[PDB]
Amino acid sequence: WTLNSAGYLLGKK
Description:
Layout: no helix or strand
């Protein structure tokens, strides 16, 4: 697992 502000695995533009 990783800590992200925008997304780690999911995130569509």
